Amino acid sequence: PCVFTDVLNQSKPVTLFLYGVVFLFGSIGNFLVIFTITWRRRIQCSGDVYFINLAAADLLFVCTLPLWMQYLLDHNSLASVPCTLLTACFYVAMFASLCFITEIALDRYYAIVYMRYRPVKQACLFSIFWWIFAVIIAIPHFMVVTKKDNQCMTDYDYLEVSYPIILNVELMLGAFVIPLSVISYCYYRISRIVAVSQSRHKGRIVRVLIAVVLVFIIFWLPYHLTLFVDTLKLLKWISSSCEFERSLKRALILTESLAFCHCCLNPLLYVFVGTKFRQELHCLLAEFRLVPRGPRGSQVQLVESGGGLVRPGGSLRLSCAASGSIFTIYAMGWYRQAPGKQRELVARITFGGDTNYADSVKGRFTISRDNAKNAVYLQMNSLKPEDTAVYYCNAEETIVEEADYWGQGTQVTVSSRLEV
């Protein structure tokens, strides 16, 4: 035999604290993500869909931590039926978190390098598929863990000794090798394009994508590197004393809790690294528990054209395009400002196709796009004298989520002096 009674009892108090830490910040940060994109605003692009789904996978994960904490406090208190069920939510939430993390890069891969964009309706459908794929891939990971023994876990007293090895290989490549290979290749292809583009945020874009990979490695690699030498023990390629298995168990415990911190960093790696999500969160925090908050060129410029004077009921076509080579723009829109009034949105269209019009112009104006040329046109039929304002063109950028691309502004006058 080989006893492990003292190693688990000495690591338990350290593990219980970090669990509470991961449960505290992970539940707050991942609730704010969902709350920011759905409160007093709606879903805009295909990234928000995957962001919510990633936050949903993290919430389901973090909600198991208080149950895991009650398990260490009293080992017996967890029965069979809850342990298999609690373990089911653990792996399903883990694989879906990894599935959607990979989908972040791919959707931004096809959008940046290949200029193919997915609308929200398609992104929701794929999200359903990813949850299904995460469940079917988690079946062999909890069906063996349904042991209400002294310690709930694999407990491979039965099954062949190669069964944990196949499960580790499937776990090592499915949860680390394949995800890290895709997001490294995707963000490398993207970074080498942005660094040469004319984007005014090209510096921070690459630094954002680099942070995603580093945090993913320094938090997941220690756990899979420890599973690698554990699989080496099962393969009988290396020797293992009783003490060696105890050192390997303690290394498994600490590095596994390290991987649990990754679900607390996902809000800081995708969502709240963007200025638009920071400003949107700052307004939500402002109504309740925060204070209301109260280059410029020589790069990419928005060429505007189509303004002029026209009688009431006439027609105009506004045109806007990017004067540089930028590949990180995912949406553009039109804004106007009447004398003595504030700047208001009139028509916004994303490169996925989802359009959004203002109340006063809906049914009269029609906004259209061109992805390959980064151009957006606004057909203004049945013009009214109330539409007399200075129309500005705006462009939005991906990853960093900035909308500081503005045009010079074109004039649209309807109510003027006309003779018989």
Author numbering: 22 to 315, 997 to 1122
Paper text:
Human cytomegalovirus (CMV) has ‘hijacked’ a relatively ligand-specific human GPCR, and repurposed it through evolution to serve as a highly cross-reactive ‘chemokine sink’ as a mechanism to subvert host immunity. US28 binds with high affinity to many CC-type chemokines, in addition to CX3CL1. US28 signals constitutively via the G protein Gq, and cells expressing US28 exhibit constitutive cell migration, which is thought to principally occur through β-arrestin signaling. Single chain fusions of US28 with intracellularly directed nanobodies (Nb7 or Nb11) enable purification of stable, apo-US28 that can be used to stain yeast cells displaying chemokine on their surface, thereby solving the general problem of structural instability of GPCRs purified in apo form.
To assess the impact of ligand binding on the structure and dimensions of the US28 ligand binding pocket, we determined the crystal structure of apo-US28Nb7 without an extracellular ligand to 3.5 Å resolution. In contrast to the chemokine-bound structures, access to the extracellular binding cavity of US28 is significantly constricted in apo-US28, where ECL1 and ECL2 collapse inward. CX3CL1 displaces ECL1 and ECL2 away from the receptor core, uncovering the binding pocket but causing minimal overall distortion. Conversely, CX3CL1.35 distorts TM1, TM6, and TM7 away from the receptor core, resulting in an expanded binding pocket. US28 was truncated by 10 amino acids at the N-terminus and 44 amino acids at the C-terminus. The protein was concentrated to 28 mg ml−1, aliquoted, and flash-frozen before crystallization trials.
